[PDB]
Design an enzyme around this catalytic site. Structure first.
Site, PDB file in Angstrom:
ATOM      1  N   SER A   1       0.299  15.797 -11.920  1.00  0.00           N
ATOM      2  CA  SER A   1       0.171  15.471 -13.326  1.00  0.00           C
ATOM      3  C   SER A   1       0.004  16.756 -14.147  1.00  0.00           C
ATOM      4  O   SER A   1      -0.644  17.711 -13.681  1.00  0.00           O
ATOM      5  CB  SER A   1      -0.988  14.522 -13.548  1.00  0.00           C
ATOM      6  OG  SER A   1      -1.273  14.306 -14.919  1.00  0.00           O
TER       7      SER A   1
ATOM      8  N   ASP B   1       0.824  -1.206   0.000  1.00  0.00           N
ATOM      9  CA  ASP B   1       0.000   0.000   0.000  1.00  0.00           C
ATOM     10  C   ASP B   1       0.858   1.256   0.000  1.00  0.00           C
ATOM     11  O   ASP B   1       1.315   1.679   1.058  1.00  0.00           O
ATOM     12  CB  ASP B   1      -0.907  -0.042   1.211  1.00  0.00           C
ATOM     13  CG  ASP B   1      -1.899   1.123   1.285  1.00  0.00           C
ATOM     14  OD1 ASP B   1      -2.162   1.662   0.173  1.00  0.00           O
ATOM     15  OD2 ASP B   1      -2.382   1.488   2.368  1.00  0.00           O
TER      16      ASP B   1
END
Lengths: 7, 329
Positions: free
Chosen positions: B198, B35
């Protein structure tokens, strides 16, 4: 059955 | 040193991925959910309330290398509402041949219902930054953090499969596992995550929109959660798609051929195939399918979960100033 890992 | 371990989807939907982890002496093999959205290595254990165990358990009293960390406790909850808590051992932990001594192994006294219900997952191995670790009074380092001193390079890579096995590597970059080159982008650790920005997105064969999307790379989240306007732009290109209040997200006809979704990494572009966004039917045999791209408005952060990550070879560069790399594959 989606997962959503810290809150 | 290096390690390399195979990671496998737990079910036909790629809901989550499990990776074997050897804990203790002699080794006890548990399948953990790696994770990158949290920073605790916790396991089902001989300490867990019996009615809440359905999993392979860690038994610290059968490990000659286990040591109780005196006075330490832990307690964690996750975005999906799941939780667990307990006490703490240090023990020897190996992943894919890479061994760390003195790793904090958080033994669950209790686990929430969703964990009990998932027979395939024996615990979590957190790979976010150690500032998120929930051990008190003193936080504990992640497996990755402890491994860096011995690694050939302070990196790990995630190569998740599409309905297929894949690989987590520690300490090296496998140049045969990807095509083109890796483009790296800055990481902010201010919130403890592999958080990056991004450079924008495109839907299908349409135009790339330059828009900063701040989000996290989270191997422990199934879907791609993006801003509402971005997600609306995607599903506008799917003629049967609609937001379903009762189902809790965008649904579309399973027969549809979906457009790809492209996200920017610097000047580079990662293309998520349409088929990856076709997550699955809302029930077996349903004509209605749940979308793999959903709004992040409910969660409050954008999350590049497995739908996005499995389209790429992803490099978690854990140098003192961390960076995140993506390559096509």
């Amino acid at each position: 059955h989606p997962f959503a890992x810290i809150h | 040193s290096t390690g390399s371990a195979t990671t496998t989807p737990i079910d036909s939907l790629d809901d989550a991925y499990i990776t074997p982890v050897q804990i203790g002496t002699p080794a006890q093999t548990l399948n953990l959910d790696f994770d990158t959205g949290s920073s605790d290595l916790w396991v089902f254990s001989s300490e867990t309330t019996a009615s809440e165990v359905x999993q392979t358990i860690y038994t610290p009293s059968k490990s000659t290398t286990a040591k109780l960390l005196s006075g330490a406790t832990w307690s964690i909850s996750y975005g999906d509402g799941s939780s667990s808590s307990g006490d703490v051992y240090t023990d020897t932990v190996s992943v894919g041949g890479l061994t760390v001594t003195g790793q904090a192994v958080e033994s669950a006294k209790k686990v929430s219902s969703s964990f009990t219900e998932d027979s395939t997952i024996d615990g979590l191995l957190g790979l976010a930054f150690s500032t998120l670790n929930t051990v008190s009074p003193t936080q504990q380092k992640t497996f990755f953090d402890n491994a860096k001193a011995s690694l050939d390079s302070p990196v790990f890579t995630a190569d998740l499969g599409y309905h297929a096995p894949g690989t987590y590597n520690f300490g090296f970059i496998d140049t045969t596992a990807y095509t083109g080159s890796i483009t790296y982008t800055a990481v902010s650790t201010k919130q403890g995550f592999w958080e990056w920005t991004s450079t924008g997105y495109a839907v299908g064969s349409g135009t790339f929109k330059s828009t900063s999307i701040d989000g996290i790379a989270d191997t422990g989240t199934t879907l791609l959660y993006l801003p509402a306007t971005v997600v609306s732009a995607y599903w506008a290109q799917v003629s049967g798609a609609k937001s379903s209040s009762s189902v809790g997200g965008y649904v579309f006809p399973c027969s549809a051929t979906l457009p790809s979704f492209t996200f920017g990494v610097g000047s580079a572009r990662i293309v998520i195939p349409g088929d990856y966004i076709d997550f699955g039917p809302i029930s077996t045999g349903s004509s209605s399918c749940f979308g793999g791209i959903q709004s992040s408005a409910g969660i409050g952060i954008n999350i590049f979960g497995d739908v996005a990550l499995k389209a790429a070879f992803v490099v978690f560069n854990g140098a003192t100033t961390p960076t995140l790399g993506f390559a096509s594959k």
